[PDB]
């Protein structure tokens, strides 16, 4: 077949520029996410509720991606679509709207929207038109496919004919609802010409200029011109979706992101000039657009109605939320207008960023690198006698092995202990490893394999015998919970991802668990990956930060409590609850430097990124004062620091060991290790 031969020909060409591209990742979401979502959020559905496909026209292959890249790319389709929606809903129903996709690549967006078969874009069927702009070469191929693929030609009005061929191979296409126009965006003057050739000057036509990760590869000056050129088109919106480096090119995630693109020889340039959200506002004001509504991907995520999140969480197993936080904060969605009639209704409005607080430098303790390349995340570790023991974790795969850590001032020695029993705990992460039996044994509680495979089998490891014994098992599975040995030798167990009680108590000698959820409205929800320590001296303990099972909320509370050992119905009671934005951490670890100073370390936050001043801090529980333990510019810039999956070990010094993150397919990073010593 003549047509089919042509189709395949340029079908292959389209591929040489689709994989590890945003289109490939959208095909991924199209395969997995869109079929499992209800009307509101599938974007593509026929009258009979059958999902419709479009990204398959440029990337047919079954594409797959981690659960973090997928949620991100769902957020990303929902980014553009929520904004286009606000414009279509408000603009009077007779006005012509024009969507101009700047550097569209193989983005099938127009066809997703123009297709009368898709009842989830009915508001686009009549009065919306589309202009695709990219490099000449690219549009040639893309037009070949639009012509030779009947389903596509059908949409925009071209003839569907098995027995017709258009061999011209041009870089431009003209239809009532879709045109493609070639243009090198780095040429501000050819672009400005194009704006008029297309009659975008007409004030009776509303313009929507969309820059989805394209003006991000261009130098600030080259991209600022594109933006400004459009500001002079009366009644225009500009939608820009691109990267941010809110805390500089040395933020743990930022460092990896820039470096990744450098390797792909597609550096991020504009972001260098425009680091933060506010930076984008002033930019758009300066360049013509006086009305701006902007926030990062995570504000967009909180923005989803609870009916939508519930579906999303149930799409695929997911448990990389520290990665999701970081990624989200490094991508901005910026909606700009050059006319004041258009209002950003509260449905779409982004709350302004609340100012950050400066903190007093800690006069007593400081940070100083201490290599501990255990090369693994999300295990746990506790001290026994003078020995240290790290168990399980992933690296990047889940292991069950136990490591003895010989801690030294400069470096840490590691020996793999050998198991002596025929039975062993399955390989797991996000469990807890706690010391019991007067420092003779170690208690393994909960944990998981894959995120849908929470575990309920607990174990005990005996140092002398080097044997594993499966003790009693948790009624409900449980991971990402917290733990800490109590004075009496028992083990408190906090929240986690579980259906079980919010707080458990494991009596070692009696070999039983006990639901001891405090009588407080705070504990109505299972707290995930919070910080939790107890101080035998001050006879109390703290709960710090932590997230909830909606994967959206994060406690900003520091909870002080006591332990009444002689009480068997309310052993745990809440003394006091403290609040502060810097408490709002997920995946942190806390520890007592002294009875009057609690070391709070690492984790991610829904609010913003942690910097060198507040990644590590300390709080005085009775004084209610916050002191900051700064990280040197050196350790920030030169060494690999990623506070997620790490742990705290103590033998007046607390080491920050293990930890990493895969940084959204921009490569992996490993927390090299740090130590907190007293100041000379």
> Which of the 8 DSSP states describes residue 154?
H
Give the H or E element holding residue 502.
none
Region of residue 539 (phi > 0: left; psi between -120 and 50: alpha; otherwise: beta)? left
CA nearest neighbour of 401 among 371, 372, 368, 379: 379
Report the distance separating Cα 12 and Cα 15, nearest Å.
Answer: 5
Q: How many CB atoms lie within 10 A of CB 661?
A: 27
Give the neighbor-by-neighbor strand order of the sheet with 236-243. Answer: 173-174, 178-182, 128-134, 97-102, 206-212, 236-243, 331-337, 291-296
Residue 649: partners with Cβ closer than 8 Å, 6 or more residues away: 381, 383, 388, 405, 407, 655, 657
Confirm whether residue 351 is marked as ligand binding: no
Catalytic residue among 10, 54, 73, 217: 217
Own/partner pairs, 8-17, CB within 8 angstroms, 24+ separation: 9/144, 10/141, 10/144, 10/145, 10/148, 11/60, 11/145, 13/141, 14/58, 14/59, 14/106, 14/141, 14/142, 14/145, 15/59, 17/105, 17/106, 17/138
Instruction: With beta carbons less than 8 A apart as the criterion, state whether 649 and 285 touch.
Output: no
Report the distance separating Cα 603 and Cα 609, nearest Å.
Answer: 10
Instruction: With beta carbons less than 8 A apart as the criterion, state whether 90 and 82 touch.
Output: no
Residue 585 among the catalytic residues:
no
Q: 365 vs 206, 428, 608, 634, CA distance in Å? A: 59, 34, 25, 17
Torsion angles phi and psi, residue 169, rounded to 5 = 60, 40
User: What is the resolution in angstroms?
Assistant: 2.7
> Which of the 8 DSSP states describes residue 448?
B
End-to-end CA distance of the chain: 81
Sign of the torsion formed by the C-alpha atoms of 155, 159, 162 and 165: negative
> Which of the 8 DSSP states describes residue 586?
B
Residue 78: partners with Cβ closer than 8 Å, 6 or more residues away: 41, 300, 304
Q: How many CB atoms lie within 10 A of CB 143?
A: 20
CA nearest neighbour of 629 among 645, 646, 643: 643
> Which of the 8 DSSP states describes residue 35?
G
Q: How many CB atoms lie within 10 A of CB 201?
A: 12
**CA 595, chain centre distance (Å):** 35
Q: Give the determination technique.
A: X-ray
Confirm whether residue 533 is marked as ligand binding: no
What is the DSSP code string of 15-26?
A: HTTTTTSHHHHH
CA nearest neighbour of 584 among 527, 526, 668, 515: 527
Report the distance separating Cα 112 and Cα 43, nearest Å.
Answer: 8
Q: 305 vs 44, 122, 301, 351, 527, CA distance in Å? A: 19, 22, 9, 16, 22
Question: Interhelix angle for 321-329 vs 67-90, to 10°?
Answer: 40
Helices (runs of H) and strands (runs of E) counted in the chain:
15, 37
Give the H or E element holding residue 104.
none
CA nearest neighbour of 224 among 177, 284, 174, 272: 284
Residues β-bridged to residue 457: 473
What is the DSSP code string of 176-193?
A: SSEEEEE--TT-HHHHHH
Confirm whether residue 184 is marked as ligand binding: yes
Sign of the torsion formed by the C-alpha atoms of 243, 248, 249 and 252: negative
Domains of the chain: 1-354 (3.40.50.150), 355-680 (2.120.10.80)
Instruction: With beta carbons less than 8 A apart as the criterion, state whether 657 and 602 touch.
Output: no
Catalytic residue among 71, 76, 283, 428: 76
Confirm whether residue 562 is marked as ligand binding: no
Report the distance separating Cα 403 and Cα 371, nearest Å.
Answer: 16
Confirm whether residue 392 is marked as ligand binding: no
Confirm whether residue 126 is marked as ligand binding: no
What is the DSSP code string of 598-619?
A: EEEE--B-SS----TTTSEEEE
> Which of the 8 DSSP states describes residue 429?
B
CA nearest neighbour of 208 among 240, 239, 175, 242: 239
Report the distance separating Cα 601 and Cα 614, nearest Å.
Answer: 9
Confirm whether residue 202 is marked as ligand binding: no
Residue 76 among the catalytic residues:
yes
Give the H or E element holding residue 153.
helix 150-156
Sign of the torsion formed by the C-alpha atoms of 657, 498, 485 and 511: negative
SS3 672: coil
Q: 378 vs 486, 555, 589, CA distance in Å? A: 22, 21, 12
Q: 175 vs 44, 207, 453, 497, CA distance in Å? A: 23, 18, 52, 53
Report the distance separating Cα 154 and Cα 147, nearest Å.
Answer: 9
Confirm whether residue 26 is marked as ligand binding: yes
Instruction: With beta carbons less than 8 A apart as the criterion, state whether 298 and 328 touch.
Output: yes
Give the neighbor-by-neighbor strand order of the sheet with 491-494. Answer: 482-485, 491-494, 503-507, 512-515
**CA 342, chain centre distance (Å):** 31
Report the distance separating Cα 667 and Cα 20, nearest Å.
Answer: 13
Instruction: With beta carbons less than 8 A apart as the criterion, state whether 423 and 410 touch.
Output: no
Give the H or E element holding residue 236.
strand 236-243
**Which string of b and e fits 332-368 if b means at least 16 CB within 10 Å?**
bbbbbbbeeebebeeebebeebeeeeebeebeebbbe
Region of residue 588 (phi > 0: left; psi between -120 and 50: alpha; otherwise: beta)? beta
**Which string of b and e fits 545-562 if b means at least 16 CB within 10 Å?**
bbbbbebbbbbbbbbbbe
Report the distance separating Cα 375 and Cα 630, nearest Å.
Answer: 24
Beta-strand runs (E) in 510-663: 512-515, 531-535, 540-544, 557-563, 572-579, 589-594, 597-601, 616-620, 625-628, 647-650, 654-657, 660-661
Instruction: With beta carbons less than 8 A apart as the criterion, state whether 618 and 598 touch.
Output: yes
Q: What is the 3-state secondary structure (H, E, C) of 312-359?
A: HHCCCCCCCHHHHHHHHHCEEEEEEECCCCCCCCCCCCCCCCCCCCCC
Instruction: With beta carbons less than 8 A apart as the criterion, state whether 233 and 195 touch.
Output: yes
């Amino acid at each position: 077949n003549v047509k089919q031969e042509r189709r395949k020909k340029y079908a292959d060409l389209a591929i040489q520029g689709t994989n590890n591209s945003s289109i490939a990742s959208k095909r991924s979401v199209e395969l997995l996410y869109l079929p499992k979502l209800s009307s509101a959020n599938n974007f593509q559905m026929d009258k009979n509720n059958k999902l419709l496909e479009y990204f398959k026209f440029f990337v047919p292959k079954k594409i797959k991606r981690s659960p973090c890249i997928n949620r991100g790319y769902w957020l990303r389709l929902f980014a553009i679509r929520s904004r286009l929606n606000s414009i279509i809903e408000q603009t009077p129903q007779d006005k012509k709207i024009v969507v101009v996709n700047l550097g569209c690549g193989y983005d099938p967006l127009p066809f997703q929207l123009l297709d009368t078969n898709n009842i989830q874009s009915q508001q686009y069927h009549d009065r919306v038109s589309f202009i695709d702009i990219d490099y000449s070469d690219l549009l040639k191929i893309k037009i070949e496919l639009i012509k030779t693929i009947p389903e596509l030609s059908k949409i925009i009005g071209l003839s569907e004919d098995k027995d017709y061929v258009d061999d011209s191979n041009v870089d431009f296409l003209t239809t009532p609802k879709y045109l493609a126009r070639p243009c090198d965006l780095n040429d501000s003057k050819m672009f400005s010409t194009l704006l008029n050739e297309c009659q975008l000057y007409d004030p009776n036509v509303v313009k929507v200029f969309v820059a989805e990760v394209s003006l991000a590869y261009m130098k600030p000056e080259r991209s600022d011109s594109i933006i400004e050129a459009t500001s002079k088109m009366e009644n225009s919106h500009f939608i820009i979706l691109e990267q941010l480096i809110p805390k500089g090119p040395f933020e743990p995630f930022s460092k990896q992101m820039l470096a990744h693109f450098k390797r792909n020889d597609s550096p991020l340039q504009s972001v260098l000039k425009y680091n933060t959200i506010e930076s984008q506002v002033q930019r758009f004001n300066k360049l013509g657009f006086a009305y701006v509504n902007v926030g990062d991907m995570f504000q967009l995520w909180e923005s989803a109605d609870e009916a939508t999140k519930k579906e999303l969480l149930k799409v695929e197993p997911f448990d990389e939320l520290e990665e999701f936080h970081l990624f989200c904060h490094h991508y901005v969605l910026c909606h700009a207008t050059n006319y004041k009639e258009f209002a950003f209704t509260q449905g779409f409005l982004f709350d302004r960023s609340i100012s950050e607080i400066n903190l007093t430098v800690d006069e007593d303790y400081q940070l100083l690198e201490c290599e501990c390349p255990i090369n693994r995340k999300f295990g746990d570790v506790d001290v026994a006698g003078n020995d240290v023991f790290y168990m399980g974790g992933s690296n990047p795969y889940r292991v069950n092995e136990i490591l003895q850590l010989s801690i030294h001032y400069d470096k840490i020695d590691m020996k793999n202990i050998e198991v002596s029993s025929s039975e062993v705990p399955v390989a797991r992460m996000c469990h807890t490893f706690t010391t019991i039996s007067r420092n003779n044994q170690l208690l393994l509680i909960g944990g998981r394999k894959a995120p849908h495979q929470g575990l309920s089998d607990n174990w005990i490891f005996d140092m002398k015998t080097r044997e594993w014994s499966m003790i009693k098992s948790l009624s409900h599975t449980r991971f990402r919970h917290s733990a800490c040995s109590l004075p009496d030798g028992n083990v408190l167990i906090l929240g986690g991802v579980t259906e079980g009680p919010a707080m458990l108590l494991y009596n070692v000698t009696e070999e039983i668990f006990k639901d001891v959820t405090p009588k407080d409205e705070f504990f109505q929800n299972s707290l995930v990956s919070a910080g939790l320590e107890f101080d035998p001296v001050s006879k109390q303990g703290i709960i710090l930060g932590g997230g909830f099972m909606d994967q959206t909320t994060v406690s900003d509370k520091a909870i002080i409590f006591k332990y009444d050992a002689e009480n068997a119905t309310e052993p745990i009671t809440v003394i006091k609850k403290l609040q502060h934005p810097l408490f709002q951490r997920y995946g942190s670890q806390i520890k007592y430097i002294t009875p009057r100073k609690l070391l709070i370390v690492g984790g991610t936050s829904p609010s913003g990124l942690f910097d060198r001043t507040n990644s590590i801090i300390s709080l005085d529980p009775l004084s209610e004062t916050l002191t900051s333990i700064p990280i040197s510019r050196r350790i920030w810039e030169d060494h690999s620091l990623m506070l997620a999956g790490f742990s705290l070990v103590s033998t007046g010094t607390i080491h920050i060991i293990g930890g990493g993150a895969t940084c959204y397919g921009f490569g992996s990073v490993t927390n090299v290790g740090l130590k907190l010593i007293a100041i000379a």
